[PDB]
Amino acid sequence: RSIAFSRAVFAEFLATLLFVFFGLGSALNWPQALPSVLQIAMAFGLGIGTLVQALGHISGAHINPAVTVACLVGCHVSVLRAAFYVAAQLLGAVAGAALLHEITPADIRGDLAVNALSNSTTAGQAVTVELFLTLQLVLCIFASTDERRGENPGTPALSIGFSVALGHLLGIHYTGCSMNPARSLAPAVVTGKFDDHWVFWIGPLVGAILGSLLYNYVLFPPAKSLSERLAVLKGLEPDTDWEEREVRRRQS
Amino acid sequence: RSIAFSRAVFAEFLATLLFVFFGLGSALNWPQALPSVLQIAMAFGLGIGTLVQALGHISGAHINPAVTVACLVGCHVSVLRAAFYVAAQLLGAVAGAALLHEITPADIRGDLAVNALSNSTTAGQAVTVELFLTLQLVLCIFASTDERRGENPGTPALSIGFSVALGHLLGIHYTGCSMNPARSLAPAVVTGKFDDHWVFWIGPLVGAILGSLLYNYVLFPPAKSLSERLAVLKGLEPDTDWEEREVRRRQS
Amino acid sequence: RSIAFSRAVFAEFLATLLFVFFGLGSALNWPQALPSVLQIAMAFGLGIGTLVQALGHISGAHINPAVTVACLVGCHVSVLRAAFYVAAQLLGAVAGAALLHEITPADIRGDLAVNALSNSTTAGQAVTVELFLTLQLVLCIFASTDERRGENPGTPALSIGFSVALGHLLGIHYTGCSMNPARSLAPAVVTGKFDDHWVFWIGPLVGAILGSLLYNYVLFPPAKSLSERLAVLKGLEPDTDWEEREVRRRQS
Amino acid sequence: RSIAFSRAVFAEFLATLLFVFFGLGSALNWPQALPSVLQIAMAFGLGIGTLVQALGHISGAHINPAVTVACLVGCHVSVLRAAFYVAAQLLGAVAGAALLHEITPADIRGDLAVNALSNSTTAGQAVTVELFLTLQLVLCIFASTDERRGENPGTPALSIGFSVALGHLLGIHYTGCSMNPARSLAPAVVTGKFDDHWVFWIGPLVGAILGSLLYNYVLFPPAKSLSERLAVLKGLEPDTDWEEREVRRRQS
Amino acid sequence: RSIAFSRAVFAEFLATLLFVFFGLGSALNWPQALPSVLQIAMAFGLGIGTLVQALGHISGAHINPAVTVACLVGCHVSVLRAAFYVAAQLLGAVAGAALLHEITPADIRGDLAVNALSNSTTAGQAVTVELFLTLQLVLCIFASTDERRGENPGTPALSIGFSVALGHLLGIHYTGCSMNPARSLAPAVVTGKFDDHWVFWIGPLVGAILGSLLYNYVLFPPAKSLSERLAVLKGLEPDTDWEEREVRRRQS
């Protein structure tokens, strides 16, 4: 260690700073125009879309820890690169929400777009929810990150973005929809709401741990490899697709 | 029997529990923010795109039986895999909705987003519309599931999702937009309201049997053949392509 | 003449029957949930997206006469194939709106989603509007239909769809937004409103005549060819992209 | 001087007249249906996608000066073409808006969708936000204008459009979402309200000069180089590719 | 790396989740029938014996952070698999505690088999107690697991079943009996009583660490090793290799 491994951290740093900034502001309980639920789901999912395409190369754009842990339970990511990843998503998230809280005037930062049990739903329900909410996403990710599909490359960006939105449009009412704890952590950090918390620890982790396992062992045949998958995804462009077809034709 | 297929069922058992668990919730009459037709349409279409995206190298994601009947009547598929898949989807649906009944508190779990005739239309109007709602879609599907369009490989997941939504945007006032019985089935199972059921059995079957037949025959082949189609769809990827054989003879 | 030339007519017939059906219903002044302008713009643009992808192969999916006339002023289409095209879009449109008027109950078919000068706008303004409204579209089309771009094939479907929506979100208030007279003709046919009509004859025709000329002569260098462009676009798949690269490598 | 370039200016003279003529109209305070933040965001983003789509083989469609300053500072472009393009865009803007003033009747042409600070925020907040609104975008742009990602060629037009919209969904309450002065400029020209102008001069320049510098250097090269980048962008297509040279030596 | 360890870690999450679910369930202050101590005793103890013979071949089924730190200080385990287990134990415990808190209605989830001072004694006396309570088990475990002792193999599980039974038979009256910090964390965790917390972290940590030195150093002769033991545990059925080399050396 190390060389460029670092820059990819900023890409993830920057990406989430933005995503929270964009998202939460787009998600606050603003009195004059109350973000419609879809407006909110869309904001974040798009944030992700921009981030996943812009800093898509560099990262694989997990822009989700559940997704990265998902990537771990299936071995798409290491254990070292993982913790450093987690860190970037976290501090970036709260940085974005921090700039957001200071760029944002006092009157509409009431809730501050908190992830909160709404309308008398128990946490078991919610955890169950967030679980599948992320699960689908981790799967989306997995499906878009699978090396075995490079002729139809797109769209990690949008696909994963809308898988996030997808979850969002649901968890907003159970939970505000985490699927991606940072979305739920940053605002909570800035103003302080811990009611029925763990929900977004296990559901998502499960759903993500699920999604991966489903992907990497259940749905793994000659395909969702382990070493080569990482070699490729981490290898990035100009990737392949290519080397296989060249060396193969030269051969036969 | 069997190989990896199981994993696809699990992929699909997984898939429908989700689309429904997310879905139904997204369309309830929440008094604070009552979902617009469009928001709900978006929920599912997004769902479709993600699930269709998540579990493909394993399952293929028709995420519609009429579409299977379409693909079936279009000879895109055979006779056994159909019945076993239908079962997996149904039980996933009620799995999510029971988990949901358990996930959902007592005071607001009333209608449960049942598919029901809206705005003084007879059953025949509803069935008629669903025909086309699905037809446009099945066509979108068949065209997007088209192997033969690798020059414009895009955009299966979202095309079908947004076709589903397209259908939703009209079909919500005529039918609530089933285009796909399970969505109507799960909640109905849980609560007990059954008038003029068959309406939402017939239309989709017409429109889909149409769309396929229109697509697979009226528009014969369209390059697709019948069985050739099945071969390609079965190889999953990788396997036998036009440009492959091209670059391969050019060098010998 | 002739062989398959015919089937492509149905593809265009079917496509627009649907698009109007979907669109107008999605565009009527329904009292309970008044289609939001965007809902309306989206419905049609999507209709187009489905149609442009589904029957995208077959057609090039003008799903717009202005676009086809555009294709003519630049020679992307013939004069015979043109009139037969116009006919299909027209009778299909009104067929769809006819089924729509009969499938649709009496109370909300008041206006019937008419293209109408709204809020004291003169026709000169409107014609000027619709002009550019379609113009952009014809251009979109032209940009997506250009043979010279086959490595980035997509998305005639969506691109053109949203170029239609794009115009829609505007002309809805000037005009209801034609950009594509059929959208304006069919409902008007079924119920009968001819106030300030010609607007949607010249603006769009101009804007489309413009868009093409801009494309085919202004913006035409070794590229927006005339004969070969047609050979290719009409030639359809498996097109090229290909033959050029093969025969070229075999050569050099 | 000169060759075909003129056609691109005309392509672009054409382009901005449009985006604005459509745009401003889409965002007015129509009393019957008052545009939601989202509807308006959609209007423009769709605009961007279409215009960016329409006139590319000729112009390239930054459809943002900050983006040029980004591409400029990122060495994606030189020093003269900038000034002449800026002029073409500006005059197109006022062309549409004057045609619009002529296109628009007296009773409702009041504010004219002016960019103005909303919800008690200081100029510095506005400028700060626009930074990021644009930054995410410029990054999206640069990543989508990336030659180097041909394994995932998608999705420039819409990515940038929806990034523009993403920016819109937050930026409307902070700034109305300029991300691009002309949108604010045309109407303002027509009506005369000029307080604290400079705000919307500075932010975009920061965020875009950032995004590029972040993209072109902080994230150095990123494969892009400086000049190499310019070469590729200049060849337009067709010209010098990686897989081309591959298949070409393989046969010799 | 890696081979078998993985699932083998996951099993402990699961395992402790069990022992505690049962455990707490058997030790509650149900108003109607307050568990007689032996009921509870045989409950936990037979429970463990079950968990040990059951999950003996994969993990060693410490089912106790104490038992692991013993396995640790005895140089019977590596350092990582431990942190991993224990995390999994704790995390498992509380997973279970959520599931248990969910399984139970509000009226009788009062005490929650909290390890809790019942019937009048100070904490120091209580800890002095938890130490020996866990240690006798640690020793019986060490006593029944000796590779060096084969003439009295049966019945590790049962004698142990009966050992933990025997321990609770005492521990219910005073406390309900942890012997397993995890077992004590979970309830306290969910119910919120971190009263005398360290008591059940230190005692078990402490009591476990003694037995470990006596078996492995003080009472160490030509047998109770470091290495041979670890190798045997690490191997399993098959992949074990010391026993053949021994028989091969012995038959000649």
UniProtKB/Swiss-Prot annotation, chains A, B, C, D, E:
It is found in: Apical cell membrane; Basolateral cell membrane; Cell membrane; Cytoplasmic vesicle membrane. GO terms for molecular function: glycerol transmembrane transporter activity; water channel activity; water transmembrane transporter activity. GO terms for biological process: actin filament organization; cellular response to copper ion; cellular response to mercury ion; cellular response to water deprivation; glycerol transmembrane transport; metanephric collecting duct development; protein homotetramerization; renal water homeostasis. Glycans are attached at N119. It is a multi-pass membrane protein. A motif (NPA 1) lies at residues 64-66. Residues 61-70, 177-189 dip into the membrane without crossing it. The keyword Oxidoreductase does not apply. Expressed in collecting tubules in kidney medulla (at protein level). Detected in kidney. Changing R183C: In NDI2; loss of water channel activity; mutant protein does not fold properly. GO terms for cellular component: apical plasma membrane; basolateral plasma membrane; extracellular exosome; Golgi apparatus; lumenal side of membrane; membrane; perinuclear region of cytoplasm; plasma membrane. The modification Phosphoserine is found at S252. Changing G60R: In NDI2; loss of water channel activity. It catalyses: H2O(in) = H2O(out); glycerol(in) = glycerol(out). Changing T240E: No effect on sorting from the ER to the vesicles, redistribution to apical membrane, or endocytosis. Belongs to the MIP/aquaporin (TC 1.A.8) family. It is linked to Diabetes insipidus, nephrogenic, 2, autosomal: A disorder caused by the inability of the renal collecting ducts to absorb water in response to arginine vasopressin. Characterized by excessive water drinking (polydipsia), excessive urine excretion (polyuria), persistent hypotonic urine, and hypokalemia. Inheritance can be autosomal dominant or recessive. This is Aquaporin-2. It comes from Homo sapiens (Human).
